[PDB]
Amino acid sequence: QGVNIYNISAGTSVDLAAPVTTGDIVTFFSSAANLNAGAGNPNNTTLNLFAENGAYLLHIAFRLQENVIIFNSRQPDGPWLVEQRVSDVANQFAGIDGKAMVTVFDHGDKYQVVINEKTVIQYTKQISGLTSSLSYNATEETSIFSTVVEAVTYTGLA
Amino acid sequence: QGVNIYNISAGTSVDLAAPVTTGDIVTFFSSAANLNAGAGNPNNTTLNLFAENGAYLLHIAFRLQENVIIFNSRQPDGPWLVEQRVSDVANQFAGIDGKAMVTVFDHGDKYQVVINEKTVIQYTKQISGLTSSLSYNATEETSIFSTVVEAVTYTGLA
Secondary structure (H helix, E strand, O other), X not given: OEEEEEEEEOOEEEEEEEEEOOOOXXXXXXXXXXXXXXXXXXXXXXXXXXXOOOOEEEEEEEEOOOOEEEEEXXXXXXXXXXXXXXXXXXXXXXXXXXXXXXXEEEOOOXXXXXXXXXXXXXXXXXXXXXXXXXXXXXXXXXXXXXXXXXXXXXEOOO | OEEEEEEEEOOEEEEEEEEEOOOOEEEEEEOOOOOOXXXXXXXXXXXXXXXXXXXXXXXXXXXXXXXXXXXXXXXXXXXXXXXXXXXXXXXXXXXXXXXXXXXXXXXXXXXXXXXXXXXXXXXXXXXXOOEEEEEEEOOOOOOOOOOEEEEEEEEOOO
């Protein structure tokens, strides 16, 4: 029903004009896929869906060195909750080369995360509610994505 | 439920591994928005959703010179049906500059077309059925989009 486009530069957040809720979709598009970049500190790149109060509803962290993708949630002044890990970063991106897209489906009780065309995990939510903002963090030298990542939300779907 | 990514170069078509049906979404992403390009011949750019038999379920033609976007449908060896026109090409793209995305929502009886963040038209279908393939046509010199346009489909939504 509705589409919104956001240009997110590395290390910045953006507020959504249309929050994402159950039944909605969000896709992060990177024109690059630097899977052979230097080590993160410790994260090479992070993608995040935030609640109205700034809590990390979904934190996606890519670490080339540890060679794993971490998924977690946490309140603004709170600790990371239960960590979910998916091993082999490059493997999750296989299929589409040179660029990448991370799509998150809000399924109410879980977040379905698809890297390129592969569903990497069905994340059981640890914090619920609507997604009010987004962020993409990484340094200028070791991000696995382009300096700018386009985020596109599809809302009013349910 | 499912995501598929296709790289479509100007003047080519691609077959979908997952056809698009009622409730599904397709987005064409262009890293450029050449709204000041030379005249089309007559189309500067066209985006198409095709049926299993190759019929044009939805034909989107951008003509800078005529300064209008045309929407129509037709069978492979048939004539264009009822033409729907939207005047002022640049106006439909306003809001997002430098790049562009055309999203099509298959609503069963109609196709909702969103250019960037603006719903440009609720197209009453003249030919029904599932979308089996996609295409992006334009010359190498006057397309309003980049040489390569990424198409992303979101299927299994209904």
